[PDB]
């Protein structure tokens, strides 16, 4: 069996930036106390993973990426009370340690045991658990789901419904709950409002889907990629516009189109020009601009503070404001109850081994979410 | 009767920037329809006035400044349904025109009729009601209270309580409502939270009072002027901090002092560095930072969007988010119902003819609020 023994499996390792992943044999150490070893069943490719490949989000290399996933618990360490082997689970990229300031504060979810802020590349106890060619391989956001087995801290893992379709539900681990919560919990979109959503990746489209579930009267979807429009529209966008069609700055276009700005604007791309245009496009006295895309390392925005004095709210959030371990369970329950559908987001299913082809699909505007099967 | 004819009186006219005010004889035209001519009983000197003298807030010159005030209604023009001659009045620097998007929206207050954003120095119909030496003099924020008589549009004037100390209550026209409102209505300070306030002028200490009124467990008051601390402590600040006493940046000191950051920070000064230190000292995952001070003409902050992505909110607000015409009276009522005391703030009362003396007191930290009487 495997419980308590090292596991040897395939995993896609990123040895260098801007280089392909290498499906390698790696040894995965057993769970220490309060840790869980999971067997990956399905994983989604998310833009945050692509940012590490591209050089925009620095994390310690070599690394096993991946964080949007669903799997079955193979073994649990001592102390682990929340998980039992055989339990279906979604690994959370933001832990909910339950004992820090942020975790106790009912409205905050960026727990202090996270590894996004200043990435160590390890698990919470400071150590790694993957070895490939004798060398230690670093973890990513403490989840590293781009491997057939991974070890995750207990506070970073959620037990979900035993009947959950893991090849659909893995989206709720990052992309969907991020997009949808951005609208429903972060910006708190109001019925009848006008919302703009910049970027239509699987997180951008769940933001559209969150604005529609909130009662937004209008949802303008912005993207330089026309092919995304049909899905946006099907999911709730009232209109879709492409910045390259206009001769004047996209915030001016939208201000003119909405009687001086939207009420709620969402940036789900991660570029500075669109984070600025997304601030600008919202109404000067009643707009909320929510930052969802992750910015390129060390870059800055020069804003005039007056943009804010008149009444604008600029905020950002991680995971759609969901406290990870309590939220992702309930959102799967909702999923089961048929409250929403993830099917339009999943455009491709590839075997794990075809991971690089999955990143090529993202890079070409051909895929919204690619799911990788183990 | 004064009515229907051009009044000639005294007004402190600013002819050039960084120049002493000239107390001069000007002609205040009669009210057109939907306008009101008011006799100034008391005027507070507020930081926004000073910025026009400094050159920090550009506005068409010559101009008669002033916007913090209480007076009695001399004549009302035609169609004026809300105030009658003799009615006690506080002119509002931000109108509540009742009909625009911002006015119909229950949460916003920067009515579109405002003359703050792109100041044209006239009343809402695009014309001035003041003359001096065969020259039209401009208005400031459609209020121009540094004149014995001023004409203001109707939507920009509130009928306050018939029995109100007009020498006290005029602070509610700007400073008290802005500072207090910023805390209670914009930041929405929570019971038991910890707030930091940068700048302890008239607006600043009213923010200290608002946080205390909101139930903040800790209120740290920051000011390079050590003499304001006694008042701050008296008004609610649990601690006072002078940036010059340190060797490390004030955010670092405050982050350290407050377990990672303050829950609510208010910048009530208007400098870029303090807007920055104000963003930085509130907790990255749950702090709200509120901009209240007014920024120098065309100066930008280079910020890193990761500062918001972790979860902190950044918002500005005009008038402490009070709908003006509806708000200032309810507060005058609260003052009248013994809810708070403006006394600590009214530091000096001078005859209006000493207005340049009043600005010198401000320019030396002697004064918190100087009231100019008529
Ligand atoms: N805040 C978080 O919690 C959180 C969570 C998950 C993902 N993210 C971030 O969300 C962002 C996107 O996520 P995704 O997985 O949905 O990625 P994605 O690649 O599928 O979506 C990006 C979309 O933006 C569009 N786009 C690119 N340039 C554009 C431009 N100049 N103008 C308009 N649109 C443009 C692209 O066509 C693409 O459709 C990434 O930056 C990711 O890092 C953040
Ligand atoms: N948003 C609005 O609705 C609104 C309304 C009223 C006033 N304001 C703005 O509020 C700001 C000030 O209000 P005020 O009327 O009380 O003026 P004020 O001059 O009396 O008070 C400003 C305080 O800032 C302190 N200070 C100065 N430099 C400092 C520094 N470098 N670091 C820390 N503290 C410093 C000064 O000692 C003073 O105590 C002004 O910028 C005014 O324009 C805005
Ligand atoms: Cl004129
Ligand atoms: Zn993600
Ligand atoms: Zn925590
Ligand atoms: Zn209005
Ligand atoms: Zn003022």
mmCIF file of C-alpha atoms in Angstrom, chain B residues 142-347:
data_model
loop_
_atom_site.group_PDB
_atom_site.id
_atom_site.type_symbol
_atom_site.label_atom_id
_atom_site.label_comp_id
_atom_site.label_asym_id
_atom_site.label_seq_id
_atom_site.Cartn_x
_atom_site.Cartn_y
_atom_site.Cartn_z
ATOM 1 C CA UNK B 142 -20.876 78.002 -4.925
ATOM 2 C CA UNK B 143 -20.768 79.282 -1.305
ATOM 3 C CA UNK B 144 -18.233 82.123 -1.004
ATOM 4 C CA UNK B 145 -18.905 82.776 2.680
ATOM 5 C CA UNK B 146 -15.971 85.305 3.289
ATOM 6 C CA UNK B 147 -18.392 88.147 2.570
ATOM 7 C CA UNK B 148 -21.044 89.761 4.773
ATOM 8 C CA UNK B 149 -23.655 88.616 2.291
ATOM 9 C CA UNK B 150 -23.455 85.840 -0.316
ATOM 10 C CA UNK B 151 -25.858 84.343 -2.805
ATOM 11 C CA UNK B 152 -25.933 80.506 -2.952
ATOM 12 C CA UNK B 153 -28.137 78.126 -5.051
ATOM 13 C CA UNK B 154 -31.036 76.652 -3.080
ATOM 14 C CA UNK B 155 -29.906 72.970 -3.236
ATOM 15 C CA UNK B 156 -26.626 74.122 -1.678
ATOM 16 C CA UNK B 157 -28.289 75.550 1.532
ATOM 17 C CA UNK B 158 -29.776 73.856 4.578
ATOM 18 C CA UNK B 159 -32.388 75.105 6.957
ATOM 19 C CA UNK B 160 -30.898 74.304 10.309
ATOM 20 C CA UNK B 161 -32.482 74.711 13.738
ATOM 21 C CA UNK B 162 -34.068 78.088 14.441
ATOM 22 C CA UNK B 163 -32.417 78.176 17.873
ATOM 23 C CA UNK B 164 -28.819 77.286 16.956
ATOM 24 C CA UNK B 165 -25.593 78.964 18.200
ATOM 25 C CA UNK B 166 -24.474 80.150 14.737
ATOM 26 C CA UNK B 167 -20.971 80.741 16.071
ATOM 27 C CA UNK B 168 -20.636 77.089 16.995
ATOM 28 C CA UNK B 169 -22.933 75.210 14.576
ATOM 29 C CA UNK B 170 -21.047 76.665 11.538
ATOM 30 C CA UNK B 171 -18.356 73.933 11.942
ATOM 31 C CA UNK B 172 -21.016 71.426 10.862
ATOM 32 C CA UNK B 173 -21.010 73.271 7.468
ATOM 33 C CA UNK B 174 -17.655 71.548 6.622
ATOM 34 C CA UNK B 175 -14.927 70.365 9.169
ATOM 35 C CA UNK B 176 -17.142 68.576 11.695
ATOM 36 C CA UNK B 177 -19.303 66.812 9.122
ATOM 37 C CA UNK B 178 -16.347 65.835 6.996
ATOM 38 C CA UNK B 179 -14.157 64.395 9.825
ATOM 39 C CA UNK B 180 -16.992 62.804 11.815
ATOM 40 C CA UNK B 181 -18.740 61.540 8.712
ATOM 41 C CA UNK B 182 -15.586 60.049 7.262
ATOM 42 C CA UNK B 183 -15.422 57.812 10.362
ATOM 43 C CA UNK B 184 -19.105 56.985 10.986
ATOM 44 C CA UNK B 185 -20.332 56.878 7.352
ATOM 45 C CA UNK B 186 -17.430 56.370 4.934
ATOM 46 C CA UNK B 187 -14.975 54.046 6.751
ATOM 47 C CA UNK B 188 -17.866 52.731 8.844
ATOM 48 C CA UNK B 189 -15.669 52.070 11.884
ATOM 49 C CA UNK B 190 -16.631 48.968 13.734
ATOM 50 C CA UNK B 191 -16.996 48.557 17.525
ATOM 51 C CA UNK B 192 -13.746 47.513 19.094
ATOM 52 C CA UNK B 193 -11.668 48.386 15.978
ATOM 53 C CA UNK B 194 -8.368 50.260 15.994
ATOM 54 C CA UNK B 195 -8.132 53.413 13.877
ATOM 55 C CA UNK B 196 -5.283 55.778 13.145
ATOM 56 C CA UNK B 197 -5.939 59.518 12.160
ATOM 57 C CA UNK B 198 -3.245 61.504 10.289
ATOM 58 C CA UNK B 199 -3.644 65.243 10.956
ATOM 59 C CA UNK B 200 -5.380 66.880 13.870
ATOM 60 C CA UNK B 201 -6.877 70.055 12.488
ATOM 61 C CA UNK B 202 -10.582 70.764 12.672
ATOM 62 C CA UNK B 203 -11.449 67.970 10.281
ATOM 63 C CA UNK B 204 -8.916 65.557 11.920
ATOM 64 C CA UNK B 205 -10.209 65.790 15.471
ATOM 65 C CA UNK B 206 -13.796 65.452 14.264
ATOM 66 C CA UNK B 207 -12.577 62.101 12.675
ATOM 67 C CA UNK B 208 -11.103 61.222 16.175
ATOM 68 C CA UNK B 209 -14.589 62.079 17.629
ATOM 69 C CA UNK B 210 -16.326 59.969 14.929
ATOM 70 C CA UNK B 211 -14.107 56.910 15.630
ATOM 71 C CA UNK B 212 -14.852 57.324 19.372
ATOM 72 C CA UNK B 213 -18.561 57.678 18.535
ATOM 73 C CA UNK B 214 -18.294 54.525 16.377
ATOM 74 C CA UNK B 215 -16.756 52.602 19.245
ATOM 75 C CA UNK B 216 -13.129 52.195 18.135
ATOM 76 C CA UNK B 217 -11.179 50.492 20.919
ATOM 77 C CA UNK B 218 -8.005 52.329 19.890
ATOM 78 C CA UNK B 219 -7.508 55.687 18.184
ATOM 79 C CA UNK B 220 -3.895 56.616 17.445
ATOM 80 C CA UNK B 221 -3.606 60.318 16.488
ATOM 81 C CA UNK B 222 -0.643 61.296 14.321
ATOM 82 C CA UNK B 223 0.592 64.859 13.904
ATOM 83 C CA UNK B 224 3.907 66.573 13.548
ATOM 84 C CA UNK B 225 2.405 69.340 15.714
ATOM 85 C CA UNK B 226 2.775 68.167 19.207
ATOM 86 C CA UNK B 227 0.405 70.833 20.588
ATOM 87 C CA UNK B 228 -2.753 69.181 19.087
ATOM 88 C CA UNK B 229 -2.349 66.015 21.217
ATOM 89 C CA UNK B 230 -4.065 67.304 24.381
ATOM 90 C CA UNK B 231 -7.160 68.086 22.390
ATOM 91 C CA UNK B 232 -7.003 64.692 20.589
ATOM 92 C CA UNK B 233 -6.672 62.841 23.861
ATOM 93 C CA UNK B 234 -9.526 64.969 25.257
ATOM 94 C CA UNK B 235 -11.640 64.136 22.224
ATOM 95 C CA UNK B 236 -11.007 60.338 22.117
ATOM 96 C CA UNK B 237 -7.502 59.418 20.862
ATOM 97 C CA UNK B 238 -6.058 56.659 22.993
ATOM 98 C CA UNK B 239 -2.471 57.656 21.864
ATOM 99 C CA UNK B 240 -0.818 60.426 19.897
ATOM 100 C CA UNK B 241 2.312 59.941 17.775
ATOM 101 C CA UNK B 242 4.680 62.463 16.344
ATOM 102 C CA UNK B 243 6.497 61.196 13.214
ATOM 103 C CA UNK B 244 9.560 63.244 14.081
ATOM 104 C CA UNK B 245 10.200 61.280 17.302
ATOM 105 C CA UNK B 246 11.267 58.270 15.192
ATOM 106 C CA UNK B 247 13.951 56.786 13.155
ATOM 107 C CA UNK B 248 11.761 54.313 11.177
ATOM 108 C CA UNK B 249 8.797 55.346 8.858
ATOM 109 C CA UNK B 250 5.504 55.917 10.641
ATOM 110 C CA UNK B 251 3.774 52.964 8.889
ATOM 111 C CA UNK B 252 6.396 50.591 10.284
ATOM 112 C CA UNK B 253 5.918 52.057 13.809
ATOM 113 C CA UNK B 254 2.143 51.779 13.461
ATOM 114 C CA UNK B 255 2.190 48.261 11.887
ATOM 115 C CA UNK B 256 4.276 47.211 14.809
ATOM 116 C CA UNK B 257 2.164 49.004 17.335
ATOM 117 C CA UNK B 258 -1.017 47.411 16.069
ATOM 118 C CA UNK B 259 -0.381 43.718 15.409
ATOM 119 C CA UNK B 260 0.133 44.105 11.713
ATOM 120 C CA UNK B 261 -1.921 47.227 11.111
ATOM 121 C CA UNK B 262 -4.728 49.487 11.962
ATOM 122 C CA UNK B 263 -8.286 48.494 11.042
ATOM 123 C CA UNK B 264 -9.157 51.977 9.707
ATOM 124 C CA UNK B 265 -6.697 54.758 8.713
ATOM 125 C CA UNK B 266 -7.810 58.372 7.805
ATOM 126 C CA UNK B 267 -5.446 60.815 6.113
ATOM 127 C CA UNK B 268 -6.859 64.316 7.110
ATOM 128 C CA UNK B 269 -3.978 66.549 5.931
ATOM 129 C CA UNK B 270 -3.629 66.316 2.110
ATOM 130 C CA UNK B 271 0.032 65.388 1.541
ATOM 131 C CA UNK B 272 1.064 62.525 -0.728
ATOM 132 C CA UNK B 273 3.442 60.916 1.790
ATOM 133 C CA UNK B 274 0.814 60.837 4.461
ATOM 134 C CA UNK B 275 -1.710 59.356 1.978
ATOM 135 C CA UNK B 276 0.873 56.633 1.398
ATOM 136 C CA UNK B 277 1.729 56.071 5.071
ATOM 137 C CA UNK B 278 -1.949 56.058 5.686
ATOM 138 C CA UNK B 279 -2.520 53.228 3.153
ATOM 139 C CA UNK B 280 0.487 51.237 4.425
ATOM 140 C CA UNK B 281 -0.338 51.253 8.131
ATOM 141 C CA UNK B 282 -3.696 49.545 7.876
ATOM 142 C CA UNK B 283 -3.675 45.787 7.851
ATOM 143 C CA UNK B 284 -3.113 44.402 4.277
ATOM 144 C CA UNK B 285 -6.005 42.010 4.572
ATOM 145 C CA UNK B 286 -8.678 43.838 6.456
ATOM 146 C CA UNK B 287 -7.871 47.516 6.815
ATOM 147 C CA UNK B 288 -9.791 50.319 5.135
ATOM 148 C CA UNK B 289 -7.823 53.514 4.440
ATOM 149 C CA UNK B 290 -9.969 56.682 3.882
ATOM 150 C CA UNK B 291 -8.508 59.717 2.033
ATOM 151 C CA UNK B 292 -10.103 62.952 3.506
ATOM 152 C CA UNK B 293 -7.372 65.565 2.953
ATOM 153 C CA UNK B 294 -7.312 67.258 -0.443
ATOM 154 C CA UNK B 295 -4.360 66.419 -2.728
ATOM 155 C CA UNK B 296 -1.976 69.059 -4.182
ATOM 156 C CA UNK B 297 -2.717 70.119 -7.682
ATOM 157 C CA UNK B 298 -1.753 67.297 -10.021
ATOM 158 C CA UNK B 299 0.557 65.134 -7.887
ATOM 159 C CA UNK B 300 0.383 61.309 -8.104
ATOM 160 C CA UNK B 301 1.134 58.406 -5.903
ATOM 161 C CA UNK B 302 3.098 55.459 -7.465
ATOM 162 C CA UNK B 303 1.452 52.472 -5.733
ATOM 163 C CA UNK B 304 1.839 48.728 -5.929
ATOM 164 C CA UNK B 305 -1.484 46.981 -6.656
ATOM 165 C CA UNK B 306 -0.473 44.061 -4.465
ATOM 166 C CA UNK B 307 -1.192 46.459 -1.571
ATOM 167 C CA UNK B 308 -4.944 46.230 -2.454
ATOM 168 C CA UNK B 309 -5.028 42.641 -3.799
ATOM 169 C CA UNK B 310 -4.365 41.217 -0.365
ATOM 170 C CA UNK B 311 -7.673 42.671 0.748
ATOM 171 C CA UNK B 312 -7.387 46.274 1.903
ATOM 172 C CA UNK B 313 -9.989 48.811 0.793
ATOM 173 C CA UNK B 314 -8.898 52.384 -0.301
ATOM 174 C CA UNK B 315 -11.715 55.018 -0.564
ATOM 175 C CA UNK B 316 -12.120 58.792 -0.535
ATOM 176 C CA UNK B 317 -15.196 60.856 0.278
ATOM 177 C CA UNK B 318 -16.352 64.387 0.193
ATOM 178 C CA UNK B 319 -18.468 65.764 3.083
ATOM 179 C CA UNK B 320 -18.024 62.698 5.260
ATOM 180 C CA UNK B 321 -20.457 61.008 2.933
ATOM 181 C CA UNK B 322 -23.472 62.980 4.253
ATOM 182 C CA UNK B 323 -26.103 63.856 1.554
ATOM 183 C CA UNK B 324 -25.618 67.640 2.330
ATOM 184 C CA UNK B 325 -29.059 69.202 2.365
ATOM 185 C CA UNK B 326 -30.520 66.261 4.297
ATOM 186 C CA UNK B 327 -27.466 65.603 6.436
ATOM 187 C CA UNK B 328 -26.218 68.859 7.956
ATOM 188 C CA UNK B 329 -29.668 69.685 9.521
ATOM 189 C CA UNK B 330 -29.979 66.188 11.182
ATOM 190 C CA UNK B 331 -26.574 66.778 12.708
ATOM 191 C CA UNK B 332 -27.507 70.309 13.851
ATOM 192 C CA UNK B 333 -30.469 68.585 15.457
ATOM 193 C CA UNK B 334 -28.036 66.101 17.144
ATOM 194 C CA UNK B 335 -25.867 69.059 18.351
ATOM 195 C CA UNK B 336 -29.039 70.743 19.606
ATOM 196 C CA UNK B 337 -30.016 67.468 21.294
ATOM 197 C CA UNK B 338 -26.715 67.590 23.247
ATOM 198 C CA UNK B 339 -24.935 64.826 21.330
ATOM 199 C CA UNK B 340 -21.499 66.431 20.893
ATOM 200 C CA UNK B 341 -19.566 69.657 21.513
ATOM 201 C CA UNK B 342 -17.701 71.712 18.981
ATOM 202 C CA UNK B 343 -16.100 73.772 21.708
ATOM 203 C CA UNK B 344 -12.712 72.053 21.769
ATOM 204 C CA UNK B 345 -12.344 72.802 18.108
ATOM 205 C CA UNK B 346 -13.281 76.484 18.233
ATOM 206 C CA UNK B 347 -9.960 77.742 19.309
#
